[PDB]
Amino acid sequence: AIRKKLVIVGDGACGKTCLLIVFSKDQFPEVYVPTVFENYVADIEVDGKQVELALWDTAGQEDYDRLRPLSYPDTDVILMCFSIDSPDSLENIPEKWTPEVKHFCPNVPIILVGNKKDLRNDEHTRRELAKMKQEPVKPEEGRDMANRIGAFGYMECSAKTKDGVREVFEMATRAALQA
Amino acid sequence: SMEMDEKDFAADSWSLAVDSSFLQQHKKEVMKQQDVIYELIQTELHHVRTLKIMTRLFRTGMLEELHLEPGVVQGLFPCVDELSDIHTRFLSQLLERRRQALCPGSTRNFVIHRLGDLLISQFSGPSAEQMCKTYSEFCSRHSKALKLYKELYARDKRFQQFIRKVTRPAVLKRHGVQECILLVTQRITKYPLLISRILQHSHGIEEERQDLTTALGLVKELLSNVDEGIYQLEKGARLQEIYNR
Numbered sequence: 001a002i003r004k005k006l007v008i009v010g011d012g013a014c015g016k017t018c019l020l021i022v023f024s025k026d027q028f029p030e031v032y033v034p035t036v037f038e039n040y041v042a043d044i045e046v047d048g049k050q051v052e053l054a055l056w057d058t059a060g061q062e063d064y065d066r067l068r069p070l071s072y073p074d075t076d077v078i079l080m081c082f083s084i085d086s087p088d089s090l091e092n093i094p095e096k097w098t099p100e101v102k103h104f105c106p107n108v109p110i111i112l113v114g115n116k117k118d119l120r121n122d123e124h125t126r127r128e129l130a131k132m133k134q135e136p137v138k139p140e141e142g143r144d145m146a147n148r149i150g151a152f153g154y155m156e157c158s159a160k161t162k163d164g165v166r167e168v169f170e171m172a173t174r175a176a177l178q179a
Numbered sequence: 180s181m182e183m184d185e186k187d188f189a190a191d192s193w194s195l196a197v198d199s200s201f202l203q204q205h206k207k208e209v210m211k212q213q214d215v216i217y218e219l220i221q222t223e224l225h226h227v228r229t230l231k232i233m234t235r236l237f238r239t240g241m242l243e244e245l246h247l248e249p250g251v252v253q254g255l256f257p258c259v260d261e262l263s264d265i266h267t268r269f270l271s272q273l274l275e276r277r278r279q280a281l282c283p284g285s286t287r288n289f290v291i292h293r294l295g296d297l298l299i300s301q302f303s304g305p306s307a308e309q310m311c312k313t314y315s316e317f318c319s320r321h322s323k324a325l326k327l328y329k330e331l332y333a334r335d336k337r338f339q340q341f342i343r344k345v346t347r348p349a350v351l352k353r354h355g356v357q358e359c360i361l362l363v364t365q366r367i368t369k370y371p372l373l374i375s376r377i378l379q380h381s382h383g384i385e386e387e388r389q390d391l392t393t394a395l396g397l398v399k400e401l402l403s404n405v406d407e408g409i410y411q412l413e414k415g416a417r418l419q420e421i422y423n424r
């Protein structure tokens with residue numbers, strides 16, 4: 001089992017902390033959803049290769065430009081997250097998070113991940129966003145942003161229902177193993 | 180971590196730590212407030228435990244088993260004793276507040292109503308000055324510590340055997356040398372998230388809502404001062420590289 005390192009980046013509202021929690025427990029918490037994630041080493045077997053994938057969050061580091069890059073050394077794969085119920089989080093991907101990740105993690109694969117895909121057809125979500133002349137992110141808008149920023153791939157998931165969460169982390173492991 | 184504290188913080192939440200008959204006596208908003216305070220104390224207990232792995236397992240083991248050059252162990256673990264002193268004292272105060280709150284005849288049923296004042300004390304005066312001075316130094320030596328560890332692991336056979344030996348047990352899975360350094364760096368930026376969620380469920384008593392509002396501002400002031408006092412030290416960097424920064 002080789003050791004690989006994953007770091008998730010994105011705005012505070014993208015749901016990155018919840019995604020790391022639901023993956024590490026293989027369960028959306030039924031009693032208490034933790035405010036914070038410390039770290040985790042997941043045992044993953046992808047395509048017959050065994051890997052120990054260390055998981056890290058950047059939540060709470062968004063306003064601190066000198067503390068935040070301390071999470072980046074020796075990273076093997078970046079998960080760049082946005083929320084599908086938040087077009088503003090997708091707008092921040094190409095000129096805030098992408099230049100930073102490419103500077104501190106050169107040649108490290110980036111997977112653009114659209115979180116909260118369960119809210120794309122949520123009526124309360126559609127009514128609230130319509131007030132600010134907005135709508136949930138379309139699948140093609142996510143694919144085009146991933147293509148534009150030079151992402152390794154584009155994926156979607158829902159931490160609430162667990163759909164697509166395992167696939168994201170198995171693909172991150174595959175990306176971390178590439179030359 | 181001592182067994183008494185581990186058992187007290189073994190449950191996933193405060194609602195699962197207390198007796199179900201004691202839980203039933205509280206309103207929904209108090210259970211939500213207590214679940215977040217329990218998360219803050221339990222993660223502080225884990226943070227202090229991370230600092231003890233660095234001081235007792237790693238640092239002390241290298242001094243008593245290996246023959247490294249002078250100033251190498253200090254370079255690997257900068258400010259670990261000072262950090263351990265700040266957080267063991269803060270953990271002591273948090274656990275003492277939980278202990279005083281316990282019902283007579285019980286070692287698990289408690290409600291903490293007055294956390295704000297303790298947080299204002301930790302993030303103001305001399306203790307905030309020491310946290311700022313210590314994190315500003317530690318975070319500025321982060322990259323030098325990681326590069327020194329990699330050189331030692333790759334070139335020293337006895338150091339590599341030592342690391343492989345002490346990190347082999349399953350309880351050390353998340354706690355290698357580099358993982359411990361990032362766990363500590365990331366700790367301070369977890370406080371605003373926890374304090375803000377505690378504040379969200381502390382409107383019942385105006386004085387408590389005000390004390391947590393003051394505590395949140397003091398934590399953010401501290402983080403801004405630490406962030407502004409960081410410059411990565413580099414072994415071998417010349418003065419010219421430094422003043423042309």
Ligand SMILES: CN(C)C(=O)Cn1ncc2ccccc21
Pocket residue numbers: 065099100103
């Ligand atoms: C001209 N410079 C300094 C850069 O292009 C490097 N860069 N890019 C993003 C970023 C964030 C923090 C620090 C330096 C960063």
